[PDB]
Design an enzyme around this catalytic site. Structure first.
Site, PDB file in Angstrom:
ATOM      1  N   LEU A   1      35.743  38.818  51.128  1.00 29.49           N
ATOM      2  CA  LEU A   1      37.076  38.196  50.908  1.00 29.49           C
ATOM      3  C   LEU A   1      37.050  36.648  50.714  1.00 29.49           C
ATOM      4  O   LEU A   1      37.786  35.898  51.395  1.00 29.49           O
ATOM      5  CB  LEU A   1      38.068  38.619  52.016  1.00 29.49           C
TER       6      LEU A   1
ATOM      7  N   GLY B   1      28.859  27.159  36.651  1.00 34.03           N
ATOM      8  CA  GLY B   1      29.267  26.307  35.523  1.00 34.03           C
ATOM      9  C   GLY B   1      29.302  26.998  34.187  1.00 34.03           C
ATOM     10  O   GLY B   1      28.724  28.065  34.015  1.00 34.03           O
TER      11      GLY B   1
ATOM     12  N   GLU C   1      42.297  23.021  38.839  1.00 29.21           N
ATOM     13  CA  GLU C   1      41.409  21.897  39.051  1.00 29.21           C
ATOM     14  C   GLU C   1      42.200  20.579  38.756  1.00 29.21           C
ATOM     15  O   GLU C   1      43.244  20.643  38.091  1.00 29.21           O
ATOM     16  CB  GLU C   1      40.198  22.036  38.148  1.00 29.21           C
TER      17      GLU C   1
ATOM     18  N   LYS D   1      25.468  26.486  40.366  1.00 28.70           N
ATOM     19  CA  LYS D   1      24.621  27.201  39.380  1.00 28.70           C
ATOM     20  C   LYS D   1      25.033  26.862  37.942  1.00 28.70           C
ATOM     21  O   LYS D   1      26.077  27.381  37.459  1.00 28.70           O
ATOM     22  CB  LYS D   1      24.612  28.734  39.571  1.00 28.70           C
TER      23      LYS D   1
ATOM     24  N   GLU E   1      38.626  29.312  36.192  1.00 26.20           N
ATOM     25  CA  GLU E   1      39.057  28.659  34.951  1.00 26.20           C
ATOM     26  C   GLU E   1      38.513  29.483  33.779  1.00 26.20           C
ATOM     27  O   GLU E   1      37.310  29.448  33.500  1.00 26.20           O
ATOM     28  CB  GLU E   1      38.554  27.199  34.892  1.00 26.20           C
TER      29      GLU E   1
ATOM     30  N   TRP F   1      28.698  26.422  29.757  1.00 24.74           N
ATOM     31  CA  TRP F   1      27.859  25.661  28.843  1.00 24.74           C
ATOM     32  C   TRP F   1      28.621  24.736  27.880  1.00 24.74           C
ATOM     33  O   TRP F   1      27.988  23.960  27.190  1.00 24.74           O
ATOM     34  CB  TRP F   1      26.929  26.599  28.077  1.00 24.74           C
ATOM     35  N   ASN F   2      29.958  24.778  27.787  1.00 26.87           N
ATOM     36  CA  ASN F   2      30.560  23.816  26.834  1.00 26.87           C
ATOM     37  C   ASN F   2      30.619  22.314  27.256  1.00 26.87           C
ATOM     38  O   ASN F   2      30.398  21.390  26.406  1.00 26.87           O
ATOM     39  CB  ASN F   2      31.884  24.303  26.271  1.00 26.87           C
TER      40      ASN F   2
ATOM     41  N   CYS G   1      37.819  25.323  25.838  1.00 27.21           N
ATOM     42  CA  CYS G   1      38.591  26.557  26.240  1.00 27.21           C
ATOM     43  C   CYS G   1      40.092  26.498  25.932  1.00 27.21           C
ATOM     44  O   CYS G   1      40.708  27.518  25.657  1.00 27.21           O
ATOM     45  CB  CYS G   1      38.394  26.924  27.713  1.00 27.21           C
TER      46      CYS G   1
ATOM     47  N   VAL H   1      22.125  28.296  29.651  1.00 24.54           N
ATOM     48  CA  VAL H   1      22.081  27.775  28.281  1.00 24.54           C
ATOM     49  C   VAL H   1      21.919  26.262  28.375  1.00 24.54           C
ATOM     50  O   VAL H   1      21.262  25.649  27.523  1.00 24.54           O
ATOM     51  CB  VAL H   1      23.350  28.174  27.437  1.00 24.54           C
TER      52      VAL H   1
ATOM     53  N   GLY I   1      34.153  33.074  30.649  1.00 28.13           N
ATOM     54  CA  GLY I   1      35.007  34.007  29.918  1.00 28.13           C
ATOM     55  C   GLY I   1      35.812  34.889  30.865  1.00 28.13           C
ATOM     56  O   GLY I   1      35.443  35.070  32.028  1.00 28.13           O
TER      57      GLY I   1
HETATM   58  K   LIG Z   1      20.140  24.294  25.631  1.00 28.20           K
HETATM   59  K   LIG Z   2      38.545  34.306  53.268  1.00 29.45           K
END
Ligand SMILES: [K+]
Ligand SMILES: [K+]
Ligand SMILES: NC(=O)c1ccc[n+]([C@@H]2O[C@H](COP(=O)([O-])OP(=O)(O)OC[C@H]3O[C@@H](n4cnc5c(N)ncnc54)[C@H](OP(=O)(O)O)[C@@H]3O)[C@@H](O)[C@H]2O)c1
Ligand SMILES: [K+]
Ligand SMILES: [K+]
Ligand SMILES: [K+]
Ligand SMILES: [K+]
Ligand SMILES: [K+]
Ligand SMILES: [K+]
Lengths: 489, 489, 489, 489
Positions: free
Chosen positions: B245, B149, B463, B175, B251, B151-152, B285, B179, B229
């Site tokens: 693989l 994930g 997504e 995960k 994103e 943080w925004n 983003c 932050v 990023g």
């Molecule tokens: K925080």
């Molecule tokens: K695969």
């Protein structure tokens, strides 16, 4: 010495490479140097990429039906030069003329044909949000894409990769294997003759560590499609990711199971067994290299398999009565020899062949006998690892669940298949097997319509079918606000 | 600490980590320690995978409508817990209550609700070949997947990744950003209460270089979905690729262009530009951080932007009245302030803002003023580079073709928008802009039905929408032969 | 006697009718008898049905690509014969050669070409129920279908009906209008030459009330597709339904509105109005025969309409420089002139035209002048009723909501259109118009990809696009039980 | 009478009819008058249509997810009231409480649940033509539609019709069978309690000759969906056509073949056969009323059928141990007994049953004993015509090709099935059977996901599955021209 020195193909004619360096292509049937073949420089790549950018513009500015007619006109020529093309692929690869005339260009073009008709069927979506707003999506070309081919079906794979990319409105730069560069240059000629615009299909010859790598790293290539071995696929996929986040497709290796159930007709079972293993001198990635038979039927079934391996016609690929030639290269012959010495040492029973064959002419080539091992186990080097040559491991079992259990126990997931006459068992079992290509009472047919690719470490994405065409476009969502815009500030 | 120590969530409950280590999460409005949080070990990652393997089997063995009902029950609990979860999100991110109460849980739950309805609609294909043979395809789960994930939008990202993953019959290990770890654990609790089987949504807290890496490396995880990023996304994708693989969705960030054509409503135009730069304090983003304005409207546009920025209510995010909060962290404030100094040094003109707000209590928080530069040029660092704080760059242009070419002249490709009342211009311009997320006469709305993601270095895959659901399944192709089988040996 | 007697086409050759009955087809420009044409018997309908049952088994037993190649070859022949078939269409209909050489065969073959490529794309669905049960669907041919053609676009309509029917694996019996039987017979020669099996496309000439109706009643025909007037379509659909419950497609008449908003270029608007009214001498079903002009634009618009109508080149359709031929027949002309006299009796204002053109050799033909009435009101017969000749009705409006309500105030709903420069108004106005065929800033283009047909009393079902191919197949659902069966008994 | 007089349901409440007339509904188990019921007037039809038109507008103005949520709440209410609705359905139909509690409401709500999740998935298409032009489609509501129900599954059919109609944005006026009017009124109450706007689902009681006819003729109704006999379907479909060219769906009768092959397990083949004839006391349209058995298995098949028929628990449908009740009515009983005498008169061998049950209380009700005939012939009246009561006809065959030709030699085509353990035969035979609903090794299950309906004279269109929702919308194509417009005048 045999054919004239091969040039790079860029912008609809042959051009001089700018490296100074060449490699040789060798006819593996009898060592004959077939051609000097130029190597592309880093600035050759730059030039091929600038060509593709300006060309993609031309081709994508055409209407969808203008693109479909050009691709169909390329299909007519392939039908028309079927034989002259198959002659070339045989010299290049050592594959029998009986297969090249009947399969390689026949299925290459079958796939190009299928996609040529689908160009006008590429569509986006429309979704209403409220009275004052709706969204539509466009499916756009990626732009310049790049294909990197294998050496086992050179012209076919060149078609299976570029058919969808061109149909989806992309320019493609293709890199044939260093082992087999000849017919991909011929495909470039043909496409140009079809009316395919200059730059839309460029070809760069060379090595994977050089021109391949320079293709995966290039910031202006938007997608990489690759076919070949798993360990290479990993390096290839990591290079496209870390350079500029390219979209990818990988068609990789496998160690595919085949489960003969205890109600199977054993004549059928043996035909399927032998067809799954020896076609193209076991140089097919989907091959059913692990054969499961019930314990109560191993003697009978081992009988029928030797019976049929005894009458494989080994011979000159040039010969019309040949159905089994040399392997693609000498380097590759001794890789296979290296697994057969591995099987021997590991107490795996040898049922036929295993020995390089040199009588009269055979010695000037890379010929390996069709080889069959039996009474194998799961931890054997030959049972766990991909070979890519005519080596069939045969394994006994006691129940259905155990056979499936053992069929799934692999990092690989390319193909799988079952032989039964029972409706329930056929579907139930196939639903439980972890492969992307599954066969019931057959092996090897790969229709233009059928998506094919690997589970696990055999692949990312798919080839053939409607799905594959979609994955050579990018989705753009457009939201149209027809009413007021509200801001919090 | 304001709260109890935060533990790992494996198998429908909280469990002790086995690292012997923790980290703090901090309220960026005031510096309050919110909680100590456990770091997951390598063996905790192995424990989470074994738990997801077993749980996915149970989830997959239910009917389509059984999964649908469970996911709809989770939606219902989210609506009920909206205000509480929004209050916790505001603590962890600094985002105003006015945003978390209306956007984060509302739209995260909108997507889960969308996919919950769609479970029964996942279908394969069937393709006849001849009287004696047909193919069908299955869309089977991938198995265990992982999400990483950002943080925004912490709980919104958790929902946007887990909803299609679970609707498609997979298990996910998630995960959250170090932050912002708090709301992801609350979503794991709610899936459990809703009826989601133990192990189907597990949460592992810890760092990207450690737990993110051990997730992207694991051989039993089939797909990685990552938001963050571009530089880090490159490392993630290459690790996901070279290890086994894995399939991936990325994103990433951008430097997305907004073009205001001279026939635009200028107040609409300024409303859009301030919403596209200053919502969530400039940490979205898809923000339109390059604003192209025609030479003849630059002065009028500037006065309209200045007027709106002066009435922004920067304050305590616990005040219902605040519409602009601190940045997510003190490190991130430092980086933004560095971009602001760069802007100044390279002689862009400061229209407003341009520093840290420190009066009274604001000096305890990480508050950067809403900042606008003008007289910008394309080679400036503030213009070339993603800042991910509240910094708008206004660029002058003279003709339509120039704006579009400058808009597209970036390695990024996330979003783009146009402002014009002309029918022809709107669609013509939007069709030429190289971004996956495109808005006309609006900015920022991201409907559950609309697939979203980047061109170029801004992403891989999508997504939301019908398409994303298909991409959390693998295609199995089954050929059924009902006739005789032919062998050439 | 310009041509010899024309016979029935049954079983891949011409056959004698068993009626003892013939009709004459006449050229509308000059009264010349083009040919004697046979009328099908009731016994001949039977003969064509038995022929079709047998030929369809042959055509459906081929592979999908076998059928694609054969229809693609028919397209090549149509392309070669474009100019010849256009000449014969001009003889039979009175349409200018400038239209028939560009529109009729071009757009008819475009649709066959489109569908030829999609043959291999027709697929069923697959739906898993539980481990032990799944469903698959087949899209099977309907069998024998019948198409009944209209006289305004004789071969184009034969192409638009037969193309999806054959592509979906059916046989079709086609009945051309008695007014225009000539080009349908050549299409059947073409299909046979391309390799279409005997009996897959059979042609029966004669009347609607005898042979049209025997087709709609025959119990072995599975679907009727009809193009013609609304009152006739009710009779036809009623007969198809009550006889044996046939599937039906219906493409009928209209009174389609064109709304010109006050921001339009009046040269564009007048170009669109005149094309929407006067192409093929006003004999196009989708014509925009109610033209809504804003009070403020009324005078300048009428001047721009009058100007274009004054330079219309009415003449001999054999002259390449003609762009407005005679009507299809003298009966039809009589009907049209009665509508004109009704416009005059009812106090509508004549802008221009309004009379038969009898000067020179024009007295030998069925020529009506391009007519424009203005100052019209909604309760006028010329406004309420479809005329199907070159007669435009101009109506003044004051506001948008008024124009849309008035546009929708009809039992018809074939086409509609708007001319405006504004983004928001283009989409919002068209979303509110109750028609199946909607045009923004254009009129009349009908791409092979675009589904077309009526709302309300203007039609049932659609032609063209992906959707239409689907509607010439019937769905069969197959459920496979692979586990136990429970009886309550 | 057991209950108060039943009134029309219009605009979210009960309203008085204006005919001055009632009919009676009778419990078939004991002959009690359950209720007097109001007959709707011609004018009451106009009132219902006008209320539908207004209510449809409000419903269609909501977002997709607002409609989804409302339909899901109606599901919730139907689940909680399952047992109460079941008891009332048993009263009205005579069906066992064991059936109505487990099948009727459960599966009617399953289909409503299915479509509720799919409201947001209804999308149009997008097609690029050239840089200056593209098309999008809209899927819009039809408007007001009508459903006409049958007496065998009153509440289930009411839900299978109204679910996809409401889900696609339409209002429905529903007419239950005069035989079974009660539970449809209860469904209208539940929709209104769920929050369905006033007029979206209206209920009119009375005859087909009158009120069904008034609905099929009404010019504001856009589509009719009818369930019942083939001969009535032909009249309803013809009136819907000739009045205003309505869209239609028809689910009609059948004489469906069940073919038991020689490898079949006869315990299974007999369970399938009795469930295929005697569920709902023989009153299911898809019933396998022609049972084909191989000549050499006839003797043993017959023994296993009788043994199951002997233990069928005929009794009071209000007793939970009952699994076979009265037929729906005395008139209907009279009809079944005349078919029984036809069978005897024509010399088919009676295997069991074949009379009315009149002992103690049963004499008060409408009970026909489970009946099997054997040695049947293809020309017998019992073998050709639909009976719609508990009468199985057993038929000997000798070869596969033949059994399939006999099965297919009917004007019907509703259902078919095969019993066999062999893989190739199961699929090969099903592909040759001319029926829309096909079962392998099972009978009777009708998943919400599976499109069901008739081939040939058994229906037009389909219910359930993705495709049905698509057919409750109309397609609008929108061509957007962004460039210049060319006129020939
Ligand atoms: K925080
Ligand atoms: K695969
Ligand atoms: O089985 P089943 O006996 O129910 O089959 P059926 O007699 O075809 O009737 C099924 C449904 O159709 C209605 N119906 C009968 N004739 C009609 C007509 N001419 N127009 C419109 N609707 C009509 C029936 O009316 P009733 O309400 O009279 O049953 C019932 O609601
Ligand atoms: K070579
Ligand atoms: K990318
Ligand atoms: K004529
Ligand atoms: K209609
Ligand atoms: K009753
Ligand atoms: K039918």
């Amino acid at each position: 010495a045999r054919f004239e020195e091969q040039k790079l193909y860029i912008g609809g004619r042959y051009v001089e490479a700018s490296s100074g360096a060449t490699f040789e292509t060798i006819n593996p049937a009898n060592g004959e140097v077939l051609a000097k073949v130029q190597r592309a420089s880093r600035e050759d790549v730059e030039r091929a990429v600038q060509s593709a950018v300006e060309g993609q513009k031309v081709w994508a500015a055409m209407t969808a039906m203008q693109r479909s007619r050009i691709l169909r006109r390329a299909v007519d020529i392939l039908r028309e030069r079927n034989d002259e093309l198959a002659a070339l692929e045989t010299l290049d690869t050592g594959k029998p003329l009986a297969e090249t005339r009947s399969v390689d260009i026949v299925t290459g073009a079958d796939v190009l044909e299928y996609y040529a008709g689908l160009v006008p069927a590429i569509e986006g979506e429309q979704i209403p949000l409220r009275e004052t707003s709706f969204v539509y999506t466009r499916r756009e070309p990626l732009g310049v894409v790049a294909g990197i081919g294998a050496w086992n079906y050179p012209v076919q794979i060149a078609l299976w990769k570029s058919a969808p990319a061109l149909a989806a409105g992309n320019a493609m730069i293709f890199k044939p294997s260093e082992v087999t560069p000849l017919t991909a240059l011929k495909l470039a000629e043909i496409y140009t003759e079809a009316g395919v615009p200059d730059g839309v299909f460029n070809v760069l010859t060379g090595s994977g560590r050089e021109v391949g790598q320079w293709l995966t790293e290039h910031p202006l290539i938007e997608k990489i499609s690759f076919t070949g071995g798993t360990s290479t696929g990993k390096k290839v996929m990591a290079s496209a990711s870390s350079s500029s986040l390219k979209e990818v497709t990988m068609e990789l290796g496998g160690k595919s199971p085949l489960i003969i159930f205890p109600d199977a007709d054993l004549d059928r079972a043996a035909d399927i067994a032998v067809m799954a293993n020896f076609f193209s001198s076991g140089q097919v990635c989907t091959n059913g290299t692990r054969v499961f038979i019930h314990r109560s039927q191993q003697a009978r079934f081992e009988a029928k398999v030797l019976e049929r391996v005894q009458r494989i016609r080994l011979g000159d690929p040039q010969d019309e009565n040949t159905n089994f030639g040399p392997l693609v290269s000498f380097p590759h012959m001794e890789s296979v020899l290296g697994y057969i010495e591995s099987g021997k040492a590991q107490k795996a029973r040898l049922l036929c062949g295993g020995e390089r064959v040199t009588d009269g002419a055979f010695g000037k080539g890379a010929y390996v006998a069709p080889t069959v091992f039996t009474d194998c186990r799961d931890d054997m080097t030959i049972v766990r690892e991909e070979i890519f040559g005519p080596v069939m491991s045969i394994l006994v079992y006691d129940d259905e669940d155990e056979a499936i259990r053992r069929a799934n126990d692999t990092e690989y997931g390319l193909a799988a298949g079952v032989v039964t006459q029972d409706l329930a068992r056929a579907h139930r079992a196939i639903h439980r097997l972890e492969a992307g290509i599954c066969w019931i009472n057959t092996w090897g047919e790969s229709p233009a319509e059928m998506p094919v690719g690997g589970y696990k470490q055999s692949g990312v994405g798919r080839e053939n079918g409607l799905t594959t065409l979609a994955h050579y476009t990018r989705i753009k969502s457009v939201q149209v606000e027809l009413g007021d815009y509200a801001s919090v500030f």
